[PDB]
Structures are given as C-alpha cells and as structure tokens.
Amino acid sequence: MRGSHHHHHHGSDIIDEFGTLDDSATICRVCQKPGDLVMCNQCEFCFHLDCHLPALQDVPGEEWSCSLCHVLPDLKEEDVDLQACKLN
C-alpha cells in the first residue's frame, strides 16, 4: 500500500477494523440498520446508544449493553426429550 510517502505519523499501526460483531447482521428495526447500530447482548434487541429514549448515554464499549427487553422465555425447550424433574 505505502512505502515512504507519509514518513509515519503519531503512532505506527493504524489498527485494522475491530469489533467483528456489530456494524452488520441484525438491524435496529427502530431507526437505522445498514450503519451504526448497537445490539442488546442480553436477548435480541437492536438500537443505538442514541435511539433508546432521552437517557441512553452510558457507553460501556462496543454496542450499548442491552436494556429492559424482558423476554422471559416460557416455551423454550432445551433437549427436553425426557421429563426427569416434575414440571409439565
């Protein structure tokens, strides 16, 4: 790419694309999709630290940090082939 037309600058590395998670895949479904969109790593929501409500400015890193999605799974089945315990 280069060789000696810049003589390096502040640091020496540039850092390649980092994240390999957001910036693609799922969509916000509330304001934007193909660009800037932090997802909820606790369930399956898709928003940004600025399209929640007048109160989403806590940026921990990467995306937001999920919110109050409240997705209590009442019909989820995980290898329920044999009823060992006793809960229909």
Work out how close the CB of 46 gets to Zn ion at its nearest, in angstroms, rounded to a whole number. 7
Work out how close the CB of 52 gets to Zn ion at its nearest, in angstroms, rounded to a whole number. 8
Span 12-41, contacts to Zn ion by CB under 5 A? 28, 30-31, 40
- Pick the closer one to Zn ion by CB: 48 or 63: 48
Exactly one of 39, 48, 63, 64 binds Zn ion (CB under 5 A); that residue is 48
HSE of 26, CA atoms in CB hemisphere, 13 A: 17
The residue with tokens 């409500």 is 53
CA separation, residue 6 to residues 1, 2, 10, 34, 55 (Å): 11, 8, 11, 33, 43
Distance, in Å, from the CA atom of 38 to the CA atom of 56, rounded to the nearest integer, reads 12
Work out how close the CB of 14 gets to Zn ion at its nearest, in angstroms, rounded to a whole number. 29
Give the CA angle between residues 67, 28, 51 to the nearest 5°: 60
51 forms part of the interface with Zn ion (CB under 5 A): yes
- Interface residues with Zn ion (CB under 5 A) are 28, 30-31, 40, 42-43, 45, 47-48, 51, 66, 69
